[PDB]
């Protein structure tokens, strides 16, 4: 695929943990969603920085969800000014597993980075696995005749 490996730096992990803690403090949150910033080297991603964005989803309906994309553009110009070599390379969310509306959020993320990579960073300290699980949106062309759908293909992650 377009991504061979995603490298998530310790700064992102601390930022994601802090992001989940500060918003989780005011109100109980299923997850918090931010934007991943990094560079591209050959076919291995280099996620190195991230910032929080406003986000909310109704638990009952996956369709209802809001991401402040104007905030997303405004904060990018901040980080681009400080570090021009860090571009938007995807998004993150701290939900323990994937959500049904993640493919919908990726489309909003896809317009800033065409090969957007979603990295699920689990705040809970799992004992065995890495906290990060990188995914990319691909077209799964089925052989059963079912119409082609947008699915997340797993991409190997390394800290």
């Amino acid at each position: 695929l377009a991504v061979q490996k995603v490298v998530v730096h310790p700064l992102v992990l601390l930022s994601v943990v802090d992001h989940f803690n500060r918003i989780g403090k005011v109100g109980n949150q299923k997850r918090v969603v931010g934007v991943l910033l990094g560079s591209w080297q050959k076919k291995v991603l280099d996620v190195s920085n991230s910032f929080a964005v406003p986000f909310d989803e109704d638990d009952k309906d996956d369709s209802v969800w809001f991401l402040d994309h104007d905030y997303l553009e405004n904060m990018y110009g901040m980080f681009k000014k400080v570090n021009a070599r860090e571009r938007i390379v995807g998004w993150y969310h701290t939900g323990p597993k994937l959500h049904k509306n993640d493919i919908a959020i990726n489309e909003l993320m896809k317009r800033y980075c065409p090969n957007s990579v979603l990295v699920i960073i689990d705040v809970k300290p799992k004992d065995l696995g890495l906290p990060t699980e990188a995914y990319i949106s691909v077209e799964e062309v089925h052989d059963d005749g079912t119409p082609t759908s947008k699915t997340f293909e797993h991409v190997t992650s390394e800290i």
């Binding site: 986000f55 909310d56 309906d61 369709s63 209802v64 809001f66 402040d68 994309h69 104007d70």
Partner: protein, 189 residues
């Protein structure tokens, strides 16, 4: 007043109809251009954002102390899909909870120009949820008011409860321009 408003513009297939001159899509663009401009002069800190009410709701522009960006987004809005009013208010309410300044008051502007295809129970429970968060949704029942006059009646009555005119259900009959009836409506007062 220092309040943050979101315009739930409608781009359903029924917006191509010429019931409002020149087009319901063009008529509502003038409607937004006037109601959004009104909220600017009421308070310079007032926040206005755009949310589309297509088959799937799409927040075109979040809350901002800017007017021109709202209309440029509305310029590219094309008629497509069916109205989904149930999810439109919640997705607009969700943006209201994440506004720039929490001292602003809740306010949602809905352009209902296609029939709401939900049961009365779901519409009523939506009003109770908005009344919980002191959210006032202002709806113009233009377009198909001959069949929405009852579903929206339960919406505003339940939200307004028994006291206070928090929300209005002004209903403009088809004519020259629905915006010409907006300046006389309590929405802009």
């Amino acid at each position: 007043v220092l309040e943050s408003t979101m315009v739930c513009v409608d781009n359903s297939e029924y917006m191509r109809n010429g019931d409002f001159l020149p087009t319901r899509l063009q008529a509502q663009q003038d409607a937004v251009n006037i109601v959004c401009h009104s909220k600017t002069r009421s308070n310079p800190e007032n926040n206005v954002g755009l949310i589309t009410l297509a088959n799937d709701c799409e927040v075109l522009t979040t809350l901002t102390p800017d007017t021109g960006r709202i209309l440029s987004k509305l310029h590219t809005v094309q008629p497509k899909g069916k109205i989904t009013f149930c999810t439109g208010i919640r997705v607009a309410h969700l943006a209201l909870k994440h506004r720039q300044g929490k001292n602003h008051k809740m306010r949602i502007i809905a352009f209902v120009g296609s029939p709401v295809e939900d049961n009365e129970k779901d519409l009523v429970k939506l009003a109770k949820r908005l009344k919980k968060e002191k959210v006032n949704v202002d709806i113009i029942n233009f377009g198909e008011e001959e069949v929405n006059t009852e579903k929206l009646t339960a919406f505003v009555n339940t939200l307004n409860g028994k006291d206070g005119t928090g929300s209005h259900l002004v209903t403009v009959p088809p004519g020259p321009s629905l915006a010409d009836a907006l300046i006389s409506s309590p929405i802009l007062a």
